[PDB]
Amino acid sequence: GMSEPYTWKSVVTGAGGGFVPGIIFNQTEPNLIYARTDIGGAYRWNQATSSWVSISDSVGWVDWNKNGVDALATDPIDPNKVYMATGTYTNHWDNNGQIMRSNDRGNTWQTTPLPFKVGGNMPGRSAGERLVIDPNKNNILYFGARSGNGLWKSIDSGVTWSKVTSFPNVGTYIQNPTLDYGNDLVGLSWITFDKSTGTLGNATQTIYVGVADTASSVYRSTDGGVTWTALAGQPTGFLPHHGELSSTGDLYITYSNGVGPYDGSKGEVWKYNKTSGAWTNISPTTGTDNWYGFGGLALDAQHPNTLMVSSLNAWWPDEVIFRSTNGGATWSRIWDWGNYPERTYKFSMDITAAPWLDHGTTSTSLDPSPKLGWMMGDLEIDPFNSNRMMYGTGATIYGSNNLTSWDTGGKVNISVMAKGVEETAVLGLISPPTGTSHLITALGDVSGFRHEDLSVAPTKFQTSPSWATTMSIDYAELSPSYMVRVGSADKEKTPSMKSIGISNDGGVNWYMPNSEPSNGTKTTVGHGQVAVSASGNSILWSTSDIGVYYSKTSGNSWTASAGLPAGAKIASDRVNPNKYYGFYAGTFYVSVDGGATFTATGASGFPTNNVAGLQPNEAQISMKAVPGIEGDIWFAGGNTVENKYGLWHSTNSGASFTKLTNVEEADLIGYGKAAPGQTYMSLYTVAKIDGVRGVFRSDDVGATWVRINDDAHQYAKINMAITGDPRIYGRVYLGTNGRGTLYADPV
Ligand SMILES: [Mg+2]
């Protein structure tokens, strides 16, 4: 009775919108494929529907770091078994990781904590795979770890893990030694068995391991992992991204001068013959012809001298896939220069499943749209179908079903193959009270979208302004066609781009105003939070860098607010266009002059969230005025260290709040249409209520709560955004950090 069964569905983007660093084919069962993401868990392919199914949605609030999937192994002896190395950061933003194991292809999981951290969202996450199953004795697993933890091993099918103390090199390369992100050793890079050196039921004797160490990076054991030696004659100076052993006995290895996924300004490709020990340089480009690492590496299992590699990263005009059908002796490019600047192409891009991937720009030879990709650190050829290719980019999964057209003078048709994947991080959600859109999102990396049919990919990328990330979006409650979004324009690429966008048609079309907040010395870089007055007659912009500014001219000019500290959270009254609210460091503020001046209120007991030791995603502040009721504000957030955590309610414009005693912890608050027989809007919250973490709805102003999610639909650290629907009672829209946006209704 504490729960209400709901149907949870993804708001469809078609492309996914995030980085897919690894795609893993089972070596024994055709059409068994998995995909791992850096912040959004993993997926299993459904061959009958050409779509992906999440195997991570039971990851919840406390174990949120399991959605950083640093490695994944699928069992070739029993294809029902799959394993993941999970954990998101190896710095102070996260705790220790774990090895997860499933006997039902990811439907259910068991977990073994590791005594160190796993880095699903760390540098080098596309190198791999760093978790592998012995293909002759599948109770044996090896894990190549980060931060100097070295090589680890399981002999009980992943239940317990031990360090392989005889492995001689834990890594030496560090990407960002001066930063607090990526200042640890990248560690080991990939592990590859030689299946021919064992038989069924007996441990495979030869194991290759790549290590992020420019001086000596490739190691081999020939006694089942007891002793290790660096391969004689191996090249130095680079970092091997992948090592794949063909049935001809040749080990192919891609190298970059970084671990990726964003860098890579020099690279090589080598092959090593396991019989002779001879190394051959098969780099597709060398010298000044090469300004990029090589990342993805795909062998063709059905034609073992065919292989492909991808640049990482060439950037301009696009990335390159190189294909060889003769063991790397000669390469073909997926595109070539014609009469410069014109190019010729061996591929055709199909983004009909996610048309916004053109970013609202017309394609040219020098600025293609959509691009072949970027951050292409992983490339796969289906081991049971040489015509099927898949690769991840920073935004989607691309693939082809007619790859061999490359070899016969035809055109490889490349299409979005990310159906069912949702990987965006949700910075904001609004559900407009009128018009054809029930949901407009503010997203990282792909800006956000105005959704109409929630099952149809958006057709229109957000442009003029066009930016990577929308940090905040609001609308005028009484004139809902007027709305404002703020982000961070790339003014080196487009010096005239603005970090604020304005719409007068409910988010279909945007324009950029004439100016931005400035303190005489510096113009804001953007981001922060935006709030729109109830009538749309002013904008309040709490910038990320130079404090709070307001505009009475829809952004044509800006003036610094007074009384509200820089970095404050802000919210507009949904009735009184003169009233704004602010919050910073435990103090609540009110403005009654359209955002020009703020005054602290006596509201006490609010958290400061200044606690030392809080991880970046640990604490939240969520503050919203109620549509249709002046001076009605709800406030959620806090933390357990200050012992100030929960849900507060004010009905006197923030002069005082009541802390609801029946809500132990709360992190987000949102509103939706009132229940039948009720006059007050339904409340939607992310909270811990009577010992239960989840998503809750109240139809009686917070007196009683019912859980509307369940243990199979948790979506990790869901402190990003939430709102109900002013036109649909029971409907909730839930943002995530890695699983896109969900919407849910009673079953
Ligand atoms: Mg792969």
Q: What are phi and psi of 601, to 5 degrees?
A: -100, 165
How many angstroms separate the alpha carbon of residue 513 from the centre of ligand 1? 45
Q: Are strands 347-350 and 412-416 parallel, antiparallel or unpaired?
A: parallel
How many angstroms separate the alpha carbon of residue 611 from the centre of ligand 1? 40
| CA gap 370, 5 in Å, rounded | 41
Q: Under a CB-based contact definition with an 8 Å cutoff, are residues 280 and 274 in contact?
A: no
How many angstroms separate the alpha carbon of residue 61 from the centre of ligand 1? 29
Cα-based distances in Å from 531 to 506, 528, 570, 726: 15, 10, 7, 19
Q: What are phi and psi of 357, to 5 degrees?
A: -65, -5
Give the alpha-carbon dihedral of 108, 113, 117, 120, to 10 degrees.
Answer: -10
Q: Provide the total of helices (H) and of strands (E) in the chain, helices listed first.
A: 0, 57
How many angstroms separate the alpha carbon of residue 34 from the centre of ligand 1? 9
Residue with tokens 């299993």: 44
Among residues 720, 619, 706, 717, the alpha carbon closest in space to that of 669 is found at: 720
How many angstroms separate the alpha carbon of residue 149 from the centre of ligand 1? 23
How many angstroms separate the alpha carbon of residue 732 from the centre of ligand 1? 36
Among residues 478, 469, 466, 551, the alpha carbon closest in space to that of 509 is found at: 466
- Longest CA pairwise span in the chain (Å): 82
How many angstroms separate the alpha carbon of residue 380 from the centre of ligand 1? 6
Tokens found for residue 578: 């003169």
How many angstroms separate the alpha carbon of residue 90 from the centre of ligand 1? 22
Residues 128, 222: one domain?
yes
Tokens found for residue 471: 């940090």
| CA gap 190, 580 in Å, rounded | 54
The strand pairing partners of 267, in sequence order, are: 256
3-state SS assignment for residue 405: helix
Residues 378, 495: one domain?
no
CA dihedral (162, 163, 167, 169) positive or negative: positive
How many angstroms separate the alpha carbon of residue 204 from the centre of ligand 1? 21
Q: What angle do CA 76, 78, 83 make, to 5 degrees?
A: 75
| CA gap 416, 662 in Å, rounded | 47
Beta-carbon contacts of 285 under 8 Å, excluding residues fewer than 6 positions away, are none
How many angstroms separate the alpha carbon of residue 283 from the centre of ligand 1? 20
Among residues 352, 392, 342, the alpha carbon closest in space to that of 372 is found at: 392
How many angstroms separate the alpha carbon of residue 352 from the centre of ligand 1? 25
| CA gap 307, 381 in Å, rounded | 9
Residues 408, 537: one domain?
no
Residue with tokens 């503020």: 589
How many angstroms separate the alpha carbon of residue 23 from the centre of ligand 1? 4
How many angstroms separate the alpha carbon of residue 114 from the centre of ligand 1? 24
Question: Using only C-alpha atoms, what is the Rg of the chain?
Answer: 27
How many angstroms separate the alpha carbon of residue 665 from the centre of ligand 1? 40
Q: What are phi and psi of 252, to 5 degrees?
A: -100, 140
Cα-based distances in Å from 415 to 51, 350, 357, 529, 634: 13, 5, 11, 36, 45
Report long-range pairs for 244-249 (Cβ below 8 Å, ≥24 apart): 244/192, 244/297, 244/298, 244/299, 244/307, 245/192, 245/193, 245/194, 245/208, 245/274, 246/299, 246/304, 246/305, 246/307, 246/327, 247/301, 247/304, 248/304, 248/305, 248/327, 249/273, 249/274, 249/275
Residues 64, 81: one domain?
yes
3-state SS assignment for residue 464: coil
Residues 8, 22: one domain?
no
| CA gap 267, 543 in Å, rounded | 40
- Residue type for position 187: G
| CA gap 686, 698 in Å, rounded | 12
Q: State which of 381, 408, 423 marks the end of a domain.
A: 423
Q: Which region holds residue 327: left if phi is over 0, alpha if psi is between -120 and 50, else beta? A: left
- DSSP string across 320-366: -EEEESSTTSS-EESEEE-STT-EEESEEEE-TTSGGGGTT----SS
- Residue type for position 185: L
Among residues 537, 613, 610, the alpha carbon closest in space to that of 567 is found at: 610
Among residues 326, 293, 296, the alpha carbon closest in space to that of 308 is found at: 296
Q: Which region holds residue 710: left if phi is over 0, alpha if psi is between -120 and 50, else beta? A: beta
| CA gap 455, 9 in Å, rounded | 9
How many angstroms separate the alpha carbon of residue 95 from the centre of ligand 1? 26
Residues 35, 4: one domain?
no
3-state SS assignment for residue 561: coil
Tokens found for residue 607: 């958290």
Cα-based distances in Å from 144 to 97, 161, 253: 13, 12, 17
The CATH number assigned to the domain holding 567 equals 2.130.10.10
Report long-range pairs for 148-156 (Cβ below 8 Å, ≥24 apart): 148/184, 148/185, 148/187, 149/116, 149/187, 150/187, 150/188, 151/188, 151/209, 152/114, 153/225, 154/99
- DSSP string across 276-332: T--EEE--SS-GGG--SEEEEEEE-SSSTT-EEEEEES--SS---EEEESSTTSS-E
3-state SS assignment for residue 65: helix
Q: Under a CB-based contact definition with an 8 Å cutoff, are residues 607 and 639 in contact?
A: yes
Q: Under a CB-based contact definition with an 8 Å cutoff, are residues 500 and 517 in contact?
A: no
Residues 330, 460: one domain?
no
How many angstroms separate the alpha carbon of residue 191 from the centre of ligand 1? 12
Q: State which of 423, 455, 489 marks the end of a domain.
A: 423
> How many other CB atoms are found less than 10 A from the CB of residue 218?
25
| CA gap 153, 416 in Å, rounded | 37
| CA gap 255, 655 in Å, rounded | 62
Q: Under a CB-based contact definition with an 8 Å cutoff, are residues 232 and 277 in contact?
A: yes
Residues 123, 268: one domain?
yes
Cα-based distances in Å from 31 to 105, 384, 502: 13, 8, 46
- Residue type for position 15: A
Which residues are marked as active site?
A: 38, 445
My answer on whether omega of the bond before 465 falls inside 30° of 0, hence cis, is yes
How many angstroms separate the alpha carbon of residue 508 from the centre of ligand 1? 38
CA dihedral (544, 547, 550, 551) positive or negative: negative
Q: Under a CB-based contact definition with an 8 Å cutoff, are residues 457 and 354 in contact?
A: yes
Count structural domains, the chain.
2
| CA gap 716, 67 in Å, rounded | 7
- Residue type for position 543: T
Q: Under a CB-based contact definition with an 8 Å cutoff, are residues 669 and 663 in contact?
A: no
Buried b (16+ CB within 10 A) or exposed e, 493-503: eeeebbbbbbb
Cα-based distances in Å from 291 to 1, 204, 297, 315, 737: 62, 38, 18, 10, 33
Residues 402, 496: one domain?
no
How many angstroms separate the alpha carbon of residue 309 from the centre of ligand 1? 12
Checking the chain for breaks where C and the next N are over 2.5 Å apart, the residues before them are none
| CA gap 500, 286 in Å, rounded | 43
Burial of residue 155 (CB within 10 Å: 0-12, 13-18, 19+) is middle
Residues 150, 275: one domain?
yes
What's the residue count for the chain? Answer: 747
> How many other CB atoms are found less than 10 A from the CB of residue 366?
12
How many angstroms separate the alpha carbon of residue 222 from the centre of ligand 1? 24
Cα-based distances in Å from 259 to 124, 244, 285, 351: 5, 17, 19, 29
Buried b (16+ CB within 10 A) or exposed e, 621-652: bbbbbbbeeebbbbbbbbbebbebbbbbbbee
What stretches of 375-469 adopt beta strand conformation (E)?
A: 379-381, 389-392, 397-400, 412-416, 426-430, 439-443, 450-451
Residues 540, 407: one domain?
no
- Residue type for position 113: P
Q: State which of 387, 402, 423 marks the end of a domain.
A: 423
Residue with tokens 């209704």: 745
| CA gap 524, 344 in Å, rounded | 42
How many angstroms separate the alpha carbon of residue 21 from the centre of ligand 1? 8
Q: What angle do CA 6, 9, 14 make, to 5 degrees?
A: 175
- Chain centre to alpha carbon of residue 469: 12
Q: Under a CB-based contact definition with an 8 Å cutoff, are residues 290 and 313 in contact?
A: no
Resolution number, Å: 2.0
Q: Which region holds residue 237: left if phi is over 0, alpha if psi is between -120 and 50, else beta? A: left
Q: Which region holds residue 302: left if phi is over 0, alpha if psi is between -120 and 50, else beta? A: alpha
| Domain enclosing residue 381, as ranges | 17-423
Q: In the sheet where 580-584 sits, what is the strand order?
A: 569-572, 580-584, 587-591, 599-600
Tokens found for residue 37: 């993401």
- Residue type for position 190: W
| CA gap 700, 722 in Å, rounded | 18
How many angstroms separate the alpha carbon of residue 379 from the centre of ligand 1? 6
- Residue type for position 147: S
> How many other CB atoms are found less than 10 A from the CB of residue 514?
10
Q: Under a CB-based contact definition with an 8 Å cutoff, are residues 335 and 323 in contact?
A: no
3-state SS assignment for residue 406: helix
Residues 594, 738: one domain?
yes
- Chain centre to alpha carbon of residue 599: 39
* CA atoms within a 13 Å half-sphere pointing along the CA-CB vector of 288: 0
Q: Which protein residues have a CB closer than 5 Å to ligand 1 (ion)?
A: 22-23, 378
- DSSP string across 589-648: EEESSTTSB-EE-----------TT--TTT-EEEEEEPTTSTT-EEEEEEETTTTEEEEE
